[PDB]
Every structure is written in C-alpha cells, then in structure tokens.
Design a protein around this ligand. Structure first.
Ligand code: SAM
Length: 199
C-alpha cells in the first residue's frame, strides 16, 4: 500500500532523471532494487544493509554493511536512496549519517523518506517498531541544516495523502529530495559483498 507508493515515487524519479549509478541504503529485502532494475538507464545498482539475513552493461551488487561507515565503492553515484531508514538509527549513528552520505559519498541526488508523525488522521492498526519519529518541522529543520552544510538544495514532498475529510497535516511519508548544487561534478573497502552479478 504505502510501501508501494514509496517505491513508485522512487521509480518515477529514476525515470525522470535517468541516473546511471543508483544505491539503496537500508535496502532490506531488495524490493526497490528489483523494481528499479527495470529501467535501462541504470548501469550500476547497489543495495546496502546491516541485516545480512535480509540480503541472502548492468551490474547489481548487495553489500552487508552500515550506512555510517565509509566505503569507497559507493563514491561517484548519481542517486542514493534512504527509504524509511533514518528513524531506525540511534542518536550516534543519526549524527554520523550525514557526514558519510552527504559529506563522503557526495552523490548527485539523495532521497530520504521518513514517517510524518503529525499525519492526520493517525491510522489505528506499533510505535515501538522504530527509535524515533519526527514531525514535519523536525524533519525539515534537520534536512535544511544538512542541505546548507553540504551544499545541496532540498525539495520537500511525500506520499500518502490525507483522506478526503481530514484536515491536511502533511503526507503520511515525508520525503526530502536533495540535489547537489551545481550538479555533477584512496580505497576504503569496508562492506562485505554478499551478492553480485554483471551482464
Ligand atoms: C524500515 S526498513 C526499510 C527497508 C526498505 N528501505 C524499504 O523501504 O522497504 C529499515 C532497513 O534499514 C536497515 N538498517 C538499519 N540500520 C542500518 C544501518 N546502520 N546501515 C544499513 N542498513 C540499516 C534495516 O536492516 C532495515 O532493512
């Protein structure tokens, strides 16, 4: 339902900008990668996840690894996505996350999605699934800070519109699209490749 919408958001973005090198950080069961490989613009498609069990002309590679460690094999990418990841990082990792993804990796575009804790109406269905949840203001102040620090511009959108009678208090999933200002523009191998294929 909503995960479908998130994936389709990313697919639409890929169709629009045709990135050649795409990485999904916190890729989970690799569903998003499976969807994106459809598009022939992509020449390199990479997934990274700390959960090894979930991972068990075109090159596709899956790495067991953490978003807060610098691996040089993820340098020079066109698009990096972090879909529903940041709300599972503890304060330390959250603090390190931008210096690695924006500072070190420095891709042309980054997409970050996270729940809008203010979403109206809250659908009854747990909060204990993740570490934290952010309001729109919390996400946007964080995202603007990161944007200004690393010389990206950030566009806010999301997926999952309020149902027709509800007061609009944002999308269910809030999304920041970060674009490197000006556009494009030693080996540190840390990740362990779990799977790779090329053809
Ligand atoms: C809520 S799931 C999102 C999965 C996928 N992105 C999606 O939208 O379907 C969060 C994922 O992030 C992974 N993860 C959590 N911390 C991570 C870290 N520090 N480095 C890489 N992956 C991490 C988890 O194992 C999990 O697969």
């Amino acid at each position: 339902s909503l995960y479908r919408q998130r994936y389709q958001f990313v697919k639409n973005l890929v169709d629009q900008h045709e990135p050649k090198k795409v990485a999904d950080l916190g890729c989970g069961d690799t569903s998003l990668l499976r969807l994106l490989k459809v598009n022939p613009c992509i020449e390199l498609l990479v997934g990274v996840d700390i959960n090894e069990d979930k991972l068990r002309n075109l090159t596709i590679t899956l790495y067991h690894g953490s978003v807060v460690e610098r691996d040089s094999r993820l340098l020079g990418f066109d698009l990096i996505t972090c879909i529903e990841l940041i709300e599972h990082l503890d304060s330390g990792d959250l603090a390190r996350f931008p210096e690695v993804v924006f500072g070190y990796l420095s891709p042309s575009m980054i997409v970050i999605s996270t729940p809008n804790s203010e979403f109206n109406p809250l659908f009854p269905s747990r909060d204990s699934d993740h570490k934290f949840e952010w309001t729109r203001m919390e996400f946007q102040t964080w995202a603007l800070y990161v944007a200004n620090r690393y010389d990206y511009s950030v566009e806010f959108t999301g997926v999952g519109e309020p149902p027709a009678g509800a007061e609009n208090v944002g999308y269910c999933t809030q999304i920041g699209i970060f674009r490197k200002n000006g556009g494009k523009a030693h080996d540190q191998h840390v990740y362990k490749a779990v799977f790779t294929t090329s053809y």
